[PDB]
């Protein structure tokens with residue numbers, strides 16, 4: 424009968440896991456590498472590996488609550504669920520949209536973000552986690568500010584960088600203090616959507632700073648279950664029921 428796989432990595436995901444556990448769903452949470460469900464860690468081994476997992480574990484439903492920029496995991500979930508007739512929905516918020524006072528430009532990927540930075544040395548907040556920071560070594564004249572969940576193993580791949588180690592979630596006061604104190608001139612961010620990571624954008628607006636926003640990657644179509652209640656509804660509409 425019902426056995427959920429929740430692909431995590433965000434706050435939508437952690438909150439969702441808590442709700443599922445409260446309601447009594449048989450569910451496993453998964454991270455690539457804050458909630459009480461039994462958690463698997465690490466990749467599945469491509470689409471075939473995920474197919475094998477779904478089949479061996481008798482998964483009935485997948486909820487993809489991965490970050491919107493975890494596009495390989497999302498695309499693999501589409502393919503694997505399609506190959507096994509397992510129901511899938513994505514728990515994702517809509518992208519952020521600009522308002523008055525926002526100074527935003529958009530680029531399609533991380534490479535284009537690097538290319539978008541000015542020639543003259545700037546002070547750039549790379550608000551994009553740990554992945555692919557190296558890419559910015561192709562614009563080595565800038566000062567970079569990083570914010571990382573864990574202390575970096577080795578030396579930063581960036582000629583001039585400072586890493587602040589923190590998780591948050593972050594407040595507008597906090598982010599405005601950071602940007603101000605590091606005299607940031609530009610912010611690079613991914614268009615994640617949601618309230619949880621939006622502080623840095625309000626802070627930027629407050630300080631009158633430009634943001635280079637990386638647009639969401641393309642992922643194949645699947646059902647979208649964009650609030651906790653939407654997820655509960657979709658679960659019931661696909662015959663998922665809790666313990667007992």
Ligand SMILES: NC(=O)c1ccc[n+]([C@@H]2O[C@H](COP(=O)([O-])OP(=O)(O)OC[C@H]3O[C@@H](n4cnc5c(N)ncnc54)[C@H](OP(=O)(O)O)[C@@H]3O)[C@@H](O)[C@H]2O)c1
Nearest residue numbers: 431453454455466467468469490492493494495496551613
């Ligand atoms: N700071 C931001 O707001 C922001 C924006 C964009 C990206 N980033 C970071 O850069 C990231 C790209 O992330 P990513 O490497 O996690 O995504 P990914 O490129 O989609 O994942 C790469 C592989 O890791 C495994 N994987 C990912 N999520 C998993 C999960 N929940 N459970 C099991 N395996 C998982 C899968 O390997 P297998 O094929 O072997 O299953 C997947 O194909 C974004 O997720 C984000 O967190 C951050």
